[PDB]
Structure formats: C-alpha cells, structure tokens
C-alpha cells in the first residue's frame, strides 16, 4: 500500500480558547444600557451534536469573569450622566420620629434638618429630610453626618433609568462557538454525553442577590448539588431547586418624594413627609412549601455524607450587612431581610406563612468596591414585589470526628456564584478547520 | 426532507460521524468563518476572526491549494507517523480523535509540504523555461 | 487618444453600456474595491470594506473560480429563470436590468453552483485516486 498526505479545509475540529463575547437583546430606559448590544436573532438555531462527548468544567470558564466585568462596566457607565452629591456633606441636626411610631420601627427613622445650597451660589436655603438609622452616624437635637462623608461622595441614580433586569443574550463571534450540555442529570464537572451547538445563549436575568437566588432558571427533574470540592468546606455549595416558592415582599410606608434644587440644573430627590401609618418592611413565604423544599434538599444532600448522619441549618455567623442579610432590589428600593427565621431547624434520618423583617438602606456601595458609592432616591408610593426563589448559596462549618449534625450555613458575598448557576451549561471553544489525513492520490504532474 | 438517503446535519453536526462521511460536508464549516470601549471590543473580535481566516488562507496559499478544499500532494506518508490502516481511519474514526493523535506531528508535515511545494515550483519553472 | 476604436471610460462608467461591451471592463471595478470617536468611525468603515471584499472572495473560493474574473461552470441555465434569447441579453440589455430581473433567483443559482463544485471536487478526487 502506497500513501500520500492530504490536507482538507473545513474539517469539524475544535479546541478550548478564550475570547471576548458581546451582548445581544431585543432592544425593547433602565440601568442596563442595551444600546451597544446588536439586535438578536428572532429564532436562534440549535444544532444537536450526536456521537460526541465534551469535557465540561465549571469554576474556570472565562464567561463568568467576562460577564462580571461587563456588568460592572455597564453599571458604571449608567451613573456618569447623573449628578454627584458632593456638597451635601454638612452637619445634620436630627430628631427621632414619633408620629404614630410602632415598637418594631421605633428609633429607625430620623427627621433631619440642615443648611443646603440653592441655585444661586451666593445664597443658602434651610431644608429638612428623613433619613434611616443606617445612613447616619453621630458626631462627638443632636448633630449627625452621613456614613459616606469620610469615605467618598455618592452619586444619586437618575430617576429616568430603572433597575429592571431585562434578559441579555451572549453570542459567539465569527470563528468561535459555544457548546451547551443537554444532559438532564448533568453534574457540576465531568464529561457531558449530550452536547449541542447554539449561536446565542438563553435569556439570562442579571439579578443581583447575595443569599437567596431568585428569578433564575429552575431545574427540570430534580434538585442538584454543585461544589468544586465537597470535602473542602472553604468552597461555597450551590443548590438549584426544581419547583419555585413565592415571596411576597412590600414597603407598607406611603412615603412621598420631594425635589430640592441644590444647584443650576441639578436637583436632589429628598425623602418627603410620610403620610398615613408606618410599618416595618417584611416578606412572606409559605411554611409548607419551604418545609417540603428543605426536605427535598436534605434528601438530595444525604447521599454525599451518609444516611446515618444528621444535618442542621443555622443562621450566618457574622460579617458585613451585605453578607449576613438577603439583599435585593424590587423596583427602586433595596431591601435587607433577616433570613434567621428560615435556616433554623434540625433534621434526623427517616398561620401558613413565615414572616421575616427587612431593613431599608440608601447609601449602598454595590459589589466589593468601597472607593465609590451610589445613592438610591426614594420611590413615591407603596412598593409591592413578588418573585420565585431558585437557589441557595450554602457554606459548611468545620466539623470534628463527631461525623454528625453537619452544620450548614448560607453566605456567598461574591457575585460570580449567582451567574455560575446560569452559565454552568455553556463553554466557549475555537474551531480549527484545517485538517491532515492520508489518501491514495498522488496529484497530477505539469 | 429527511429520509433513508443523504442527511444534511448542521454546523459541526458531522463531528460525531466518521472521517469519510464528515469529508462530504467541508463547505458548511468553511462558509461560516466570516460605549466606545464596546466598539473596541467588537472591532477586536472582528479583526481576530479576519486574521485567523487570512492565516489559514495564507497557509493554503503557500502550498499548491490556494483555491480548493480537497487537494493532493507529492510527499509520501511515513508509516511511523501513524502505522494504521486506511480503511480503519476513514470508516472507524472521527476527526477529533485523529486530530488528537496527529497533533504531535503537525509542524513536521507542514514544513515538508511547504518545502515540497517550493521545490515543485522551481522544477516547473525550470521545465517551462525550455518552451 | 480617443477615437473610433475602443474607449477607456471610467470607474462604473460602463453601466449604461450593454453586457457584451461592459464585460471587458471587469478589472477597473475590481481593482478599486480596496478625536477617539472619529478613529472608531474610520476603522469601522475600513473593517466593513475589508469584510465585504473577503466575503466576495470567499464566495468565489467556494466555487471553482477562486482566481479568475471570468470562468465557466457545468450547471446549465434553466429557462424558467429568464426564458429569453441569448442575443437579446448581451446586445440589448444592461447589467442593472439583468441584475434586477434575476435578483429573486440569485440564491438558488448560488446553491446550485456550490453543490456542483462539491460534487465535482469529490468526483475528481475519486478519479485521481486510481494513480
């Protein structure tokens, strides 16, 4: 047998690589720009790849880091045209609010008054505003100052742009492609026996959460556990539900908005006088649904440490308010709920709603960026919110030879964990259409 | 319409098929190769794709296959590179596994092909000079 | 100098001329195909022009006419696309009208050309395999 080498162009070969993805949306104003995103395909094409298996892997794909960087860039870009609150750092004289106050809300809101600049630079005006206990500190009718007057001047978010988390599609550029795993019983890592090629990923909701994942993609047949190293308790534990549980959150206070013209073409949306009664913000979740969900999680988690062992749930150990409480934004108000009423029970082998209070905060510095901050203006009217819970960022506690009562605790201050639960199915690859193989042809002679 | 005859598959759908059957769909893969910071990001991706395509085209241009997907060459295949049957490679293997096995000898084959084509060009020009 | 013989004309200046007479001026049109915000605009324009030229060359490359402005193909012309005599097209029609008339059937002809080239490529490779 006589053989000669032959080169073929356009062979189906690929290799792992890193690239810069681009956004795509329907383009139907909000915090997310959505203007740089090119129009999306009306119906993305999906091609199933049979007779091939790929080595999918999480905690290493550059897609999560790229998405995180893009979200930060969009968030920073959306704050540039807004006004900065630098001349607001002055001495604030505050007094406790006592107009129809309640025991669960006493000492939380303060009525402050202070001097402030007007349109004309050669004059000053006296105004008053309402501020929460978390946005002010004492000085040493008492003087107070904002929590950020010694860190940086916050920039208030423009009222025209909302915080609606519209879906965004990520599409691979020319010469690259993204592979999705169609396996229903897929694990966090390992080989995927059902790969498929798609031009653009599904609608990913860029929801910002810290403890409980919400408004995400639910499982299709059963609960799943995700972790880089189950034995190593230093790594966070990710769990995805198969059925949702509704949470009814609200802000019963019927506050009002007031506009203070602090300068030429600049204004400050202060918190006006609150009318009607005053109550503390809270969220409601069904007891039976949560009980059943926790039971399913315990059943699905007992296969990793044994059947005889028992596990317990406890509240957060401590740290900053951004990690010890469940934070989210419903419309225009950022909540901070006390999840201690949910992670408190014991499980052993083999009237209908839970209420948890939530605190409101204005001076909020998103991400782990302490150098700059943003000021959330007060939303006029009563705030009502409803959502579906999708996952929990659990973390384990060091255990001795006891080998029982494995204590689990929530956490996950970082934001990559939230997007990892949505990008676990995709991976970007680079195609190589140049191949080499032998053939019996010798080529003509001229 | 699908039937017992030929199938169409999709973009890279022939990856699981054998080399012999995947060689018939070489056109579909080859025909699909083509806020200021965002503008930079998009232009970078576009230029990267263009450069990769031009790189492959340049490699084909150096050899005697400047304009065809399937072309033969004159250098023979040394058995040490694979020592495997012809029928078993095309009818019992896929491009991914073959590429994995021949990846350790791609540079040598490319250099041999380039040198052979250069020598063939000199020989053809010398022969043509007589006429 | 201008005279009763040939005429130079200019870039896209033979549009009004018939197809038979304008077919001799293909090279002139083919050879002419090649403050941070302003940089982005000019770069986008240049990249788009290069992408357009590359796409045209890729389309020619897929067919067996990768290196010639005028070539021939083995797939005939079905009467249903034009049903008009040959002389009335080259000697009594312009490119703008012929292009507007075939605009609805260009995709089908493109697919036929690509399929014909793929079949000829495999037939030629199989025939040359005897050597």
């Amino acid at each position: 047998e006589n053989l000669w080498v032959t080169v073929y162009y356009g062979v189906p070969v690929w290799k792992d690589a890193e690239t810069t993805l681009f956004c795509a949306s329907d383009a139907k104003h909000n915090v997310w720009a959505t203007h740089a995103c090119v129009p999306t395909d009306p119906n993305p094409q999906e091609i199933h790849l049979e007779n091939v298996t790929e080595e999918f892997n999480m905690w290493k794909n550059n897609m999560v880091e790229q998405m995180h960087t893009d979200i930060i860039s969009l968030w920073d870009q959306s704050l540039k045209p807004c006004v900065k609150l630098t001349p607001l750092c002055v001495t604030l004289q505050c007094t406790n609010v006592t107009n129809n106050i309640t025991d669960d809300m006493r000492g939380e809101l303060k009525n402050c008054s202070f001097n402030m600049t007007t349109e004309l630079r050669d004059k000053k005006q006296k105004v008053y505003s309402l501020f929460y206990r978390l946005d002010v500190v004492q000085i040493n009718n008492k003087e107070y100052r904002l929590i950020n007057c010694n860190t940086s001047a916050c920039t208030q978010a423009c009222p025209k742009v909302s915080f609606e988390p519209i879906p965004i599609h990520y599409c691979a550029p020319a010469g690259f492609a993204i592979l999705k795993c169609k396996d229903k019983k897929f694990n966090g890592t390992g080989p995927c026996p059902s790969v498929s090629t798609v031009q653009c990923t599904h609608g990913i909701k860029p929801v910002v959460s810290t403890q409980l994942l919400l408004n995400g993609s639910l499982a299709e047949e059963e609960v799943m556990i995700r972790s880089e190293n189950i034995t190593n308790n230093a790594k966070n534990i990710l769990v995805q539900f198969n059925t949702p549980v509704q949470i009814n959150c609200t802000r019963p206070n019927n506050n009002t908005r007031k506009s203070i013209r602090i300068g030429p073409g600049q204004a400050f949306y202060a918190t006006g006088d609150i009318i009607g009664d005053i109550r503390q913000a809270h969220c409601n979740v069904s007891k039976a649904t949560w009980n059943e969900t926790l039971g399913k999680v315990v059943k699905q988690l007992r296969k990793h440490f044994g059947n005889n062992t028992i596990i317990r749930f406890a509240n957060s150990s401590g740290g900053d308010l951004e990690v010890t409480t469940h934070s989210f934004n419903c419309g225009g108000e950022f909540f901070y709920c006390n999840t201690s009423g949910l992670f408190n029970s014991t499980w052993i082998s083999n009237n209908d709603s839970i209420t948890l209070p939530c605190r409101i905060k204005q001076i909020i510095n998103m991400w782990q960026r302490i150098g700059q901050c943003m000021y959330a203006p007060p939303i006029q009217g009563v705030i009502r919110c409803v959502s579906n819970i999708t996952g929990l960022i659990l973390t384990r506690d060091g255990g001795s030879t006891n080998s029982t009562t494995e204590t689990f605790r929530p956490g996950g201050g970082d934001m990559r964990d939230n997007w990892r639960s949505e990008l676990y199915k995709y991976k970007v690859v680079k195609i190589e259409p140049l191949g080499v193989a032998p053939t019996r042809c010798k080529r003509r002679v001229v | 319409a699908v039937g017992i005859g030929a199938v169409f598959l999709g973009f890279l759908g022939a990856a699981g098929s054998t080399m012999g059957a995947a060689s018939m769909t070489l056109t579909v893969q080859a025909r699909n190769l083509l806020l200021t910071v965002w503008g930079i990001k998009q232009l970078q991706a576009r230029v990267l794709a263009v450069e990769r395509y031009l790189r492959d085209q340049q490699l084909l241009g150096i050899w005697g296959c400047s304009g065809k997907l399937i072309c033969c060459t004159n250098v023979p295949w040394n058995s040490s590179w694979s020592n495997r049957n012809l029928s078993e490679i095309w009818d019992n293997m896929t491009w991914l596994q073959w590429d994995k096995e021949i990846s350790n000898y791609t540079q040598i084959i490319y250099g041999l092909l380039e040198e052979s084509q250069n020598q063939q060009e000199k020989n053809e020009q010398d022969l043509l000079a007589l006429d | 100098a201008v005279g009763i013989g040939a005429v130079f004309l200019g870039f896209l200046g033979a549009a009004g001329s018939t197809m038979g007479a304008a077919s001799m001026t293909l090279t002139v049109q083919a050879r002419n195909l090649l403050l941070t915000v302003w940089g982005i605009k000019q770069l986008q324009a240049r990249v788009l022009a290069v992408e357009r030229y590359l796409r045209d060359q890729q389309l020619l490359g897929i067919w067996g006419c990768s290196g010639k402005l005028i070539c021939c193909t083995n797939v005939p012309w079905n009467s249903s696309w034009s049903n008009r005599n040959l002389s009335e097209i080259w000697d009594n029609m312009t490119w703008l009208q012929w292009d507007k008339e075939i605009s609805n059937y260009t995709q089908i002809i493109y697919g036929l050309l690509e399929e014909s080239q793929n079949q000829q490529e495999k037939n030629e490779q199989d025939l040359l395999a005897l050597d």
Partner: antibody, heavy 125, light 112 residues
Framework: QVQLQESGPGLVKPSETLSLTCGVSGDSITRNYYYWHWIRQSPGKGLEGLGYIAYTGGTDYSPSFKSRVTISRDTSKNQFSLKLTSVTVADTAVYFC?????????????????WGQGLLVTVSS | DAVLTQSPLSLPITPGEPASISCRSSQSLLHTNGETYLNWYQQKTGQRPRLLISQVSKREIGVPDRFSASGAGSDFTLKISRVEAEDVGLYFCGQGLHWPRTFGQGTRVDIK
C-alpha cells in the same frame, strides 16, 4: 419541464392485486438527491402517504400498509410501479404519483414540487 | 403520527379584504439539525395540488407575492396579503420530517 403520468385499470374487484404504473418524463428517475412518493386522497378524508422509493433503490412504507404495499423501479424504461394486494372497498380513492425534494449534504430543500393527473381507482363487487 | 390540524375549517372571503389560515402540529417540527420542514399547498376544484410556500417562508417559483407565511415550533400561519376571485380551492399544510407524512384536513375557501 418534468411531466408525470399514471397508468392502470380504472376498476378493480375486491381481494386481488392492484397495479399502478407511473411514467416519468423530462428528468432522470435516478436523480442524485430526490425522492418519489405515491399519495392517495379520498373525499373529505384528505391526503395520506403510502410509501416511497429513494434514489439508492431502497424503499420505506407507512406502518399501516407494510403488509399490503410494494414498490418497484425500472431505470431502463424510466418508470416506477406500485403493487397493492388485498384491496377493499375502503381503498376507493384517487392515486397520485408525486416528486419531492430530499435534503442534500450541503443544503436542505423541502416540499413536493410536482404532482400527477390522478388515476381514480374504483373498488366494487 | 404528527396529526396536522388547521383552523378555521371554512373561510368565505370576497376580493378586496385579507385572509389568514392557522395550522397547528401535535409534534414539534424543529428537526435535530435546526431546520423546519413545513410546507403549504393549494388544490383547486378537480385539479392537482400545487406548492405555494416551502420551508415555512421561502416562496416557490411562479407563486405571486400575495401569499405569505411565518412561524416556528408548533404554531404556523398562512396569511394572504391580497386575494382574488381565482384563489378558490383547498389549502393544506404538510410536514416532511416525521414518517408517515401527513396533511391537514383542508380549509375551504369560497366567495361569501
């Protein structure tokens, strides 16, 4: 252009074999990527496919007619025929021999391009 | 079997007003390779059927621009931008993916 015509008896008695022969002109029966079907239609019930023969010579039939339909080909005369055994009164319908577009490796084409005149087969005792 | 069901069963229309037909499919017509295989047909009184639109929205040669279609998944529709007096006859929606092939029961069109 392509012309398809049917041929066969206009009336068939119950339980014997019914033979229909369709002649194709204007194109080769052995085209590289095309299929040929045999579809019938009765009043109000709509169309229904019986079976088909591919260019490679293979055949495939509907599950409700595997033990009754049979298709053959003859490239020498450029035609194909269908044999139906154990015909009943319920099979009374007009039979058509049509041509459809099969997906190629490079592209995908779908649809029945042309149809035949239609031989009205009457079953009576 | 992919039983195609059309709606409405009848559609009396006169020249000068638009018309539309809907065709639902029991099984999804999106093939594994990412291509749809639905076709539309027209059959006049006592005449052979003829194809109008192929591959959901690719118009066939010789078919006027008056016909149009769009859809994906399991919901598809046939919309006629302009109808004339010679557009009488049945209309069928057929799939070319699942064997045996099937067609709708047939929507009748006549003058009101």
């Amino acid at each position: 252009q392509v012309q398809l015509q049917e041929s066969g008896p206009g009336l068939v008695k119950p339980s014997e074999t019914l033979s229909l022969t369709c002649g194709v002109s204007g194109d080769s029966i052995t085209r590289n990527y095309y299929y040929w079907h045999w579809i019938r239609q009765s009043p109000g019930k709509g169309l229904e496919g019986l079976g088909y023969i591919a260019y490679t010579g293979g055949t495939d039939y509907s599950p409700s007619f595997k033990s009754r339909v049979t298709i053959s080909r003859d490239t020498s005369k450029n035609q194909f025929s269908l044999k139906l055994t154990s015909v009943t009164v319920a099979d009374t319908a007009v039979y058509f021999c049509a041509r459809e577009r099969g997906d190629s490796y490079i592209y995908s084409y779908d649809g029945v391009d042309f149809w035949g005149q239609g031989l009205l087969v009457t079953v009576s005792s | 079997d992919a039983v195609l069901t059309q709606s409405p069963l009848s559609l009396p229309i006169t020249p000068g007003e638009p018309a539309s037909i809907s065709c639902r499919s029991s099984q999804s017509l999106l093939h594994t390779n990412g291509e749809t295989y639905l076709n539309w047909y027209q059959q006049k009184t006592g005449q052979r059927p003829r194809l109008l639109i192929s591959q959901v929205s690719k118009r066939e040669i010789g078919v006027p621009d008056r016909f149009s279609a769009s859809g994906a998944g399991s919901d598809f529709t046939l919309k006629i931008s302009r109808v004339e007096a010679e557009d009488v006859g049945l209309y069928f929606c057929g799939q070319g993916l699942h064997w045996p092939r099937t067609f709708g029961q047939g929507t009748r069109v006549d003058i009101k």
